[PDB]
Amino acid sequence: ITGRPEWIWLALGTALMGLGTLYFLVKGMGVSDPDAKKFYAITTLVPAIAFTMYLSMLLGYGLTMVPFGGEQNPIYWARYADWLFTTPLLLLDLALLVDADQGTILALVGADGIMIGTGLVGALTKVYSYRFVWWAISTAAMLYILYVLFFGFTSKAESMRPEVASTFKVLRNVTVVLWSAYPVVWLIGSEGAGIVPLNIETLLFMVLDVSAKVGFGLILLRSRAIFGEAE
Amino acid sequence: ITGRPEWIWLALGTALMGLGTLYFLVKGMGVSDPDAKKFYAITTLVPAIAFTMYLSMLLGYGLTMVPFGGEQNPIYWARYADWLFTTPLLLLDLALLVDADQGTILALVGADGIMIGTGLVGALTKVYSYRFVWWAISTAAMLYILYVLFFGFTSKAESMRPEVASTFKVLRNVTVVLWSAYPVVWLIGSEGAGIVPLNIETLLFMVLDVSAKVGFGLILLRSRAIFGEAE
Amino acid sequence: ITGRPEWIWLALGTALMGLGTLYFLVKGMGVSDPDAKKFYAITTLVPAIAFTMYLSMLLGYGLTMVPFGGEQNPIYWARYADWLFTTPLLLLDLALLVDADQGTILALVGADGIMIGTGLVGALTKVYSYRFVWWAISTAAMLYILYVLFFGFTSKAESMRPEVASTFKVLRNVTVVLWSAYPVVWLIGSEGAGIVPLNIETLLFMVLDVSAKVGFGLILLRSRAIFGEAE
Ligand SMILES: CC(C)CCC[C@@H](C)CCC[C@@H](C)CCC[C@@H](C)CCOC[C@@H](CO)OCC[C@H](C)CCC[C@H](C)CCC[C@H](C)CCCC(C)C
Ligand SMILES: CC(C)CCC[C@@H](C)CCC[C@@H](C)CCC[C@@H](C)CCOC[C@@H](CO)OCC[C@H](C)CCC[C@H](C)CCC[C@H](C)CCCC(C)C
Ligand SMILES: CC(C)CCC[C@@H](C)CCC[C@@H](C)CCC[C@@H](C)CCOC[C@@H](CO)OCC[C@H](C)CCC[C@H](C)CCC[C@H](C)CCCC(C)C
Ligand SMILES: *C/C=C(C)/C=C/C=C(C)/C=C/C1=C(C)CCCC1(C)C
Ligand SMILES: *C/C=C(C)/C=C/C=C(C)/C=C/C1=C(C)CCCC1(C)C
Ligand SMILES: *C/C=C(C)/C=C/C=C(C)/C=C/C1=C(C)CCCC1(C)C
Ligand SMILES: CCCCCCCCCCCCCCC
Ligand SMILES: CCCCCCCCCCCCCCC
Ligand SMILES: CCCCCCCCCCCCCCC
Ligand SMILES: CCCCCCCCCCCCCC
Ligand SMILES: CCCCCCCCCCCCCC
Ligand SMILES: CCCCCCCCCCCCCC
Ligand SMILES: CCCCCCCCCCCCC
Ligand SMILES: CCCCCCCCCCCCC
Ligand SMILES: CCCCCCCCCCCCC
Ligand SMILES: CCCCCCCCCCC
Ligand SMILES: CCCCCCCCCCC
Ligand SMILES: CCCCCCCCCCC
Ligand SMILES: CCCCCCCCCCC
Ligand SMILES: CCCCCCCCCC
Ligand SMILES: CCCCCCCCCC
Ligand SMILES: CCCCCCCCCC
Ligand SMILES: CCCCCCCCC
Ligand SMILES: CCCCCCCCC
Ligand SMILES: CCCCCCCCC
Ligand SMILES: CCCCCCCC
Ligand SMILES: CCCCCCCC
Ligand SMILES: CCCCCCCC
Ligand SMILES: CCCCCCCC
Ligand SMILES: CCCCCCCC
Ligand SMILES: CCCCCCCC
Ligand SMILES: CCCCCCCC
Ligand SMILES: CCCCCCCC
Ligand SMILES: CCCCCCCC
Predict the structure, then answer these.
(1) Based on the structure, what is the number of domains in chain A?
(2) Has keyword Transport (chains A, B, C)?
């Protein structure tokens, strides 16, 4: 395990996701409100899935070698397995907060699936120049998602409770900033142009992942917006 | 890319799915009705997914070699990745049109999953005679789906709005004819008996795919059946 | 096929799932009640999926070799493909019976996904001692599911119809006993410590699978709890 310099960040990531999972699990024990239960379920599952995939990367299972540029390049494929399930759960948290219509939710989840799926294909593609074609398609799917979060959701939040409108606005802003960093790190890291070494890349993704999951969850689950308006 | 004679049909397929995706995306921009949004979301996602998988076939990612009959046989596995997601979306379009009950929708999607999954296993099976066992099981799942579309849905459409009944009937008929061709092409093509060469097989699937997705979508999204009855 | 001593149990399993599938399919033909249709759909799909995966194991497709302990160890990976889809369907049968809230259903299905997914990783892991780390995480996800079935569902059933409360209690008890055997068989069988040989392991899983699917389904589909209260 320690044979890879990036192991320290995989281990820290595993620990922080594990701790985040346990914290949300305990916190949600005292919850009976049916609406709050939905948000706790979604939000606890996110770091639990990430915990398993960080562990698989730490132990070496979630790593494969991909030939491109005349080299055997270490590619952590387990990231995409994580993201396939956790990024639509994160979007679902946002969509339920603002009572999004079903068509909009399906558009978001579908675009998200395309985003992660094409990122996976790009990560595993052996023809170097083609990796960036997949990156571009994935990034276009991301831009669609960000567009919807701003010009379909923000003006939906404003007709809702003030506490859900303010909580949505904060989580929207956190999401757009954090999620936009992922394609940049991929592009300059070992999957793309290879300018930033894998150990630093792994650190960067770990900070983004913990912030986008445990950070996000801490903000959401401390808000009164997750509860039905009750006396 | 041009090293494979079937590349021209993969390229045309990619282009037509891409163009179809953009057309539906633009067309749905001016839509606020919650019901119509569902149909636009579902129907736009279908060629978008197909676009990505056609591209993966064009660039060579979605192709693998399978030993059977003492030969290395080129198998485009990306078709099944496409179909796994797009065929239940197509069925969902039909089921929502007639306000199908939840049990029926689950039966359809489940049978569809079995249909595509067993087709994938058959496509990748190395014992030649066993490929046709999987083809038979998949075809039985197809026949179940077609049965339900006729003797569970058609008589559901008739108690609904005339515009939804007439639109459903047309899309049902398009679906049954087009979908029934797929097992025949598989059986006589490079996956099955090998009587029709891969380049012609690829052409045939491209025509079926564009018709079943973009053709289907053009009929559906031009109907007033996708809108709630409103003043 | 007969080259593997466990083939007889794979063949019997295939037959019993096939027969169970046909029986439930015929039985549900005379059903119009929308609630009952949901239970028939879910419950018929379960042995149908299991039938396909038992067949893939019989024909040899669903088997791979995994190096650990200095040996090439036969691992039937198709079990996890089965279980990935059938265990959440089984939980859905239970959850719908007691009209579980959406948050609880998502927690169950999510924990179940983690349970099966980590079992799959453990089954395919090449570092022997690490296989048991994945077994432990999977078992913890199982224990969460069993906890919810007892201390979240049982007291939900009691405020419902007596026929649904009594049917739920029986199916809950069947589920907890049968499902708890699976991690034990894995641990002592060819995936784990290797004390019980593969042919006996295969027998054990076949008895558990038929009981947990066809047995379970026979109890559920003969109950009046699956019908809406109607005059
Ligand atoms: C509604 C939304 C969910 C829409 C989803 C959007 C989605 C369509 C976007 C594209 C997803 C698609 C790229 C998934 C591809 C998975 C694939 C990378 C798995 C690895 O297999 C690739 C090659 C080795 O590089 O296998 C070597 C050759 C092997 C023989 C491969 C044969 C097995 C195939 C992988 C079977 C395909 C199954 C499905 C792709 C399962 C989806 C997995 C998940 C990653 C989407
Ligand atoms: C409700 C509905 C959705 C019901 C669904 C119906 C469904 C059950 C029908 C059968 C689906 C099943 C056949 C999927 C099999 C996928 C498999 C072909 C992927 C390729 O792996 C096959 C071999 C190489 O040929 O791998 C070589 C050996 C490798 C070590 C394989 C180990 C990895 C396994 C593939 C893990 C299994 C994961 C699940 C099958 C994911 C499902 C993918 C999708 C195609 C259904
Ligand atoms: C809401 C709930 C559903 C939550 C779900 C919980 C879930 C997160 C729990 C963990 C699931 C995760 C372990 C699935 C891993 C599948 C993996 C074993 C498939 C086989 O690939 C493993 C190695 C060979 O051993 O591939 C060799 C290297 C290859 C290059 C691998 C590259 C292809 C990757 C497999 C692509 C990943 C796609 C997704 C994992 C699809 C999920 C399949 C299913 C088994 C969950
Ligand atoms: C918890 C994990 C999260 C929130 C991950 C988010 C990841 C993305 C938004 C990834 C986006 C990518 C692209 C837009 C193109 C390049 C490849 C990706 C997959 C890194
Ligand atoms: C957009 C793509 C569509 C609508 C594809 C539909 C495909 C089918 C109905 C495929 C059916 C098959 C069988 C019935 C058995 C042989 C294998 C298949 C998968 C080709
Ligand atoms: C129809 C099949 C059923 C109901 C299978 C149930 C399987 C399980 C509950 C498996 C559990 C496992 C663990 C808890 C850890 C070890 C690995 C598994 C996957 C066997
Ligand atoms: C969105 C953030 C992307 C920028 C990442 C900056 C990383 C700087 C680290 C120094 C680069 C290491 C190069 C020498 C090894
Ligand atoms: C459902 C349509 C299946 C029939 C396809 C007919 C294809 C005819 C093309 C000629 C066959 C090529 C054989 C000589 C290369
Ligand atoms: C939950 C049941 C696990 C116990 C399984 C008992 C199997 C006993 C069979 C005898 C073991 C075979 C060892 C000699 C080959
Ligand atoms: C490819 C995996 C996509 C599914 C991820 C799980 C999250 C799905 C959330 C469903 C949202 C509800 C839509 C109506
Ligand atoms: C194996 C992939 C199956 C899921 C495909 C995505 C479409 C699912 C549509 C869900 C229909 C709603 C059922 C209640
Ligand atoms: C990884 C596969 C998980 C999906 C299995 C299919 C069963 C899903 C049942 C959905 C229950 C409804 C939740 C709201
Ligand atoms: C186009 C929608 C406006 C809100 C999205 C902001 C786009 C940020 C760009 C992210 C950088 C990705 C490379
Ligand atoms: C049995 C349901 C009647 C409607 C379905 C028509 C079946 C068409 C056969 C398709 C050919 C597949 C090989
Ligand atoms: C902790 C919840 C109480 C009900 C679950 C009973 C646990 C049975 C243990 C199963 C054995 C697995 C190794
Ligand atoms: C070796 C790099 C070749 C450049 C490929 C860039 C493609 C980016 C596509 C953006 C439309
Ligand atoms: C393919 C990228 C699309 C980003 C711009 C959004 C187009 C308008 C969509 C309106 C729902
Ligand atoms: C080499 C071909 C052997 C014939 C197999 C046909 C099987 C079809 C099954 C239909 C019930
Ligand atoms: C070779 C076996 C080494 C023992 C590993 C047991 C790990 C079990 C983890 C339970 C917390
Ligand atoms: C509760 C702490 C969980 C941390 C387990 C994984 C950390 C890796 C240590 C090497
Ligand atoms: C908008 C046109 C999209 C076409 C891109 C793929 C066509 C392949 C050209 C070689
Ligand atoms: C209807 C009987 C189904 C049995 C088919 C599979 C049994 C395997 C026989 C070798
Ligand atoms: C993006 C950083 C999130 C910070 C989380 C802090 C949570 C405290 C309530
Ligand atoms: C099956 C062929 C479909 C033809 C689509 C034409 C759409 C015009 C409205
Ligand atoms: C766990 C054993 C189940 C027994 C099923 C018998 C069904 C008869 C109604
Ligand atoms: C990591 C366990 C958290 C302890 C409880 C925190 C207050 C709910
Ligand atoms: C008003 C919300 C500001 C949140 C910005 C957080 C940036 C990481
Ligand atoms: C809305 C601001 C987006 C900031 C992008 C930051 C990418 C590192
Ligand atoms: C391909 C872009 C379509 C242009 C608009 C068509 C009329 C909505
Ligand atoms: C009355 C609907 C006829 C549609 C037939 C289309 C055949 C491709
Ligand atoms: C309902 C008519 C079906 C026609 C099947 C055509 C197959 C090529
Ligand atoms: C296996 C076929 C079952 C025959 C009908 C049983 C009574 C519904
Ligand atoms: C009162 C329900 C008892 C069911 C026990 C079944 C054990 C296999
Ligand atoms: C509730 C009793 C569980 C019995 C476990 C049996 C495991 C073989």
Answers:
(1) 1
(2) yes
